[PDB]
Amino acid sequence: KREHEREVIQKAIEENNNFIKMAKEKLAQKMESNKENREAHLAAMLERLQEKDKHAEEVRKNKELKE
Amino acid sequence: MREIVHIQAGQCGNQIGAKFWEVISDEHGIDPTGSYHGDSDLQLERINVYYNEATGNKYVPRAILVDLEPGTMDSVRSGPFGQIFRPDNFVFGQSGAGNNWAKGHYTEGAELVDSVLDVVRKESESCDCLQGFQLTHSLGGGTGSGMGTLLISKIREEYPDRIMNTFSVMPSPKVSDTVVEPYNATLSVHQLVENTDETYCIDNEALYDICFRTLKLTTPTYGDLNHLVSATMSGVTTCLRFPGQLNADLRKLAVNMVPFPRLHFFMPGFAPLTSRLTVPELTQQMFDSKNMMAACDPRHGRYLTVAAIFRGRMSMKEVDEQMLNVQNKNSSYFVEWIPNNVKTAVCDIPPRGLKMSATFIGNSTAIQELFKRISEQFTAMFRRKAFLHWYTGEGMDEMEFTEAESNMNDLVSEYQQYQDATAD
């Protein structure tokens, strides 16, 4: 009976620590995935805007060739 | 504090911009010298949204004045409230744009854009927590159209997580004689669909019709049209400038109004409108086609989202009852797959001279009538390739016109797709 008593309370400690552990990893995974997704969206936005700058270079260069 | 940086570009942009600052300065108790002489602490509570405060207790509009010719801005500096603007915030060229979107966007505008960005950067660096930007301009000209949209893209590169808001004046043959305006407008709409978060469609066709048919003005002047614009801009910015719960900043307004990122073109409205009043009458008027600043009949489409702002001393119970009344009796015109899509704000401070007023901001699929009108005028000239040499002469290509047209045509079909969508 003493050994069963030891096993119950160690099981309670084990399940609590695993709950904390799972919650910690899940949150770290979500934060990392969210950080990557948002940065990728900003990068795609700037890349499109830089592509417009590039097109504006061609237009001014294409005018200079006409003259 | 949540600061907004204001930019006005070109003739139309600086004209309606100057009136906007005149109108809200009176509402906030600020005289042309920048001193406060009002009588309500509500006027100063959120004053920093639009005004910087310099020592001497002076309030300076957080405003930047841009043009490729000094004519309009000289008149602004000389007109009423001309001394309230920061002198270093006047940025002007000399060559002009000549109603040419290509000159504003790629040529003379690009030569001046970096000096404008220096002023924008300076105003933004001095912000506690910048909200974003509002631009006033026309789409029919050259400096407000091409350089205005160029400024939007360049600002978005440096402030990609800030809200970009425009008050964009749509051209109309009833008001302007210039022939190439459907070109400049279509090229500009091509930019606004991609690079702004919310655009108020100020339609010169609607402003004329209101002045002529409603206000009984035989020959409306730009002063007459701009009176509607300034009254409208006052109303649509009330929630940003006074304490309130609903749509109190640019981002919350966008989250409430824009269900799909390209469909961010709003139909503004105002009541009362009468030539030189109860809550039910005020509510019925603001939803009337005659009171829209865009020449679209909302009964020809469906509402995605609506913002309504009531101003003045009135019963909030009656406002709530009448706003519910309008939605229940016109349920066919509100999409059912966006529940509770109409939001109502109430501000105690009425505009100058009115005991009470209502301002309407609609995201309706009937805005396609505006874009169909512009596309109609665009394609009538582009099939003949009329006046294309003004634009190819600056280096552009016929492909850029083709892409702009198809993007605006795509926008129309997208409004139609969501107009036809059902819940089941």
Add this chain to the structure above:
Amino acid sequence: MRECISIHVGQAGVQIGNACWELYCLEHGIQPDGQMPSDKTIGGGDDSFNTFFSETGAGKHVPRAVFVDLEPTVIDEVRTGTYRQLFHPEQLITGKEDAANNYARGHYTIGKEIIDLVLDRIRKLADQCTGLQGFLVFHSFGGGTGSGFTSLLMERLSVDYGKKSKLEFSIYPAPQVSTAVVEPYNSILTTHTTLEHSDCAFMVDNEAIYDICRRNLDIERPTYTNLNRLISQIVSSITASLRFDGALNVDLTEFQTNLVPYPRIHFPLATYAPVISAEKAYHEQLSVAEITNACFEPANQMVKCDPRHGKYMACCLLYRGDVVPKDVNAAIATIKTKRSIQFVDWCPTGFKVGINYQPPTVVPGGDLAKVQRAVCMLSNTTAIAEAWARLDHKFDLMYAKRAFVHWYVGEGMEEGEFSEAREDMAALEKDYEEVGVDSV
């Protein structure tokens, strides 16, 4: 010992917190400067009110509370208001830019910038506790901070405090006072994310409170102040067992034992009586039988639903004021013979009763009459799932077209989070169906 830490998140959580702490001060005799002349033990103590108030050597009784918001204007009113001396400035935490009614901004983009500071300030309160019992978290479902930052905070609290109990007071959205079209999204997202981290959540339907104010107090257009003063009376009834002690007092954790049969089934339905104006209460004292009867009127529920169309798994009666068991038992007998109270077959049908003898109080300038006795009923009924069904239906209408979803994806979220959250709500609705089915 047995300390409770309150955390008020976003505008709704902060303004309800203002109302609750003002009411607590009145109930205990604490002045706006924190002094409490009736407290003879200076600088500390073990009294029942010390579960919610710490004490300084200068005699100030300081709420065990943290206020957090992502913009400053709401908490700034606390900093300069009537009870500004009650709180240490470090208890009031603000950012500069709010979550813009966007769960993603409250949980990620903006919330991640302040979460560590908030936890540090909570740790400072916990360090003053000799036997911390748990947290009470006040927040809206609909706001970006109330939804997104609360979920982030609840997740972090499970890590830092383990299984230490966390209870919610959650403001369920109503169209009459809603401020965002996307509030059904934020509600389902935060309910999914918080579900495993909350031990018990008291939902407050703003429409139910709005209706009660209009009907019972004859307020034509109730304000947040109207709603929050009523909400604070219900909160006070629920927490009174922790702040006062008496012979007939029953601790909230003992009601909790009966109220939560399965971890996910942890949403009690609260009903409160009497809600009556001074002009109406002046004539007539309302008896124990009368206020108890009112508990089973659906019009007095804090969440709109029909318990008559569900099954009971627990019924608790929390009385305060001039109430004795004799009158409670007589009133309960009358109701059991004349009311539709069907329990599931796996649960006993007795009502659990507690009595706090300290009479209820009201705030000056308020709408509620000061009464001699009041009661809050806490029941676990499967009918509360109707509130989820109404939210899930508005979610489904908008999500089928992906309306507004780009605002969330733009802040780093994925559509998979919406579907995972919605599936959890579907499973939750399924759970509430299953627990009501008869055994075999």
